[PDB]
């Protein structure tokens, strides 16, 4: 049961960039195309139903997306046999509507009859963003105004520490000492071996993973969409300089603490 990334209402449709949207919000997403009930992009004028003009979006997500130009992927054919496809896991727009492809024991599982289907993969740009949750969680978050001794006192084994780059991830691992992590695939840096115990250290672009308390290292330098993705699922304790395009808009609303 998918919910609208803007307002939280039931979302039968999705943007090309991966945001779920309700009937209303199909027409307020200027960033990229939204295929609607008639099968055409909203406001395209391909038929009577998609003739009405688009509106300008009023979510700060829409402001963030002004700096992220939509790059449309090429149409690829999804071969399906015995409920399996060669195409990677993800969400795809087809003539049967939206279709999910999930990794399983046998391979990439997809709930479609045997055949070949023209498909357009949705981008991960706005994957799992929920602005209703962001508005709630940001007010119960905290930006903490090196002072790594503070982090060691507060951090626990069940916590998760998100971090922007491979370099910042490496430096966080050295500062913590004993900690769990997965070494990023295709990295030029020399990471140490992950311990059996300790707090998890995860690369920000990997998205949200369940944890007790969550931290955002160098929050001012972090990708805006990834931050929103994180605040869609949990409150954060943000770290580093407040400022150093600019930092994400959420940090103007977020409560602060010194020391
Ligand atoms: Zn909506
Ligand atoms: Zn979009
Ligand atoms: Zn139409
Ligand atoms: Zn600001």
Residue numbers in the entry: 4 to 148, 154 to 252, 259 to 273
What text does the study give?
Nsp10 belongs to the superfamily 1B (SF1B) Upf1-like family of helicases, which could unwind both DNA and RNA duplexes. In addition, this family of helicases contains an N-terminal predicted zinc-binding domain (ZBD) which is conserved in all nidovirus helicases, including 12 or 13 conserved Cys and His residues. In this paper, we present the structure of HP-PRRSV nsp10 in full length and truncation, which has a different domain arrangement compared with other helicases.
Then we obtained crystals yielded from nsp10 incubated with a partially double-stranded DNA (dsDNA) or a single-stranded DNA (ssDNA) substrate. With the methylated nsp10 as a model, we determined the structures of full-length HP-PRRSV nsp10 and a truncated form (residues 4–273) by molecular replacement. However, no additional electron density for DNA could be identified. Comparison of these three structures showed that all the overall domain arrangement was similar, except that the truncated form lacked the C-terminal 168 residues due to the degradation during the period of crystallization.
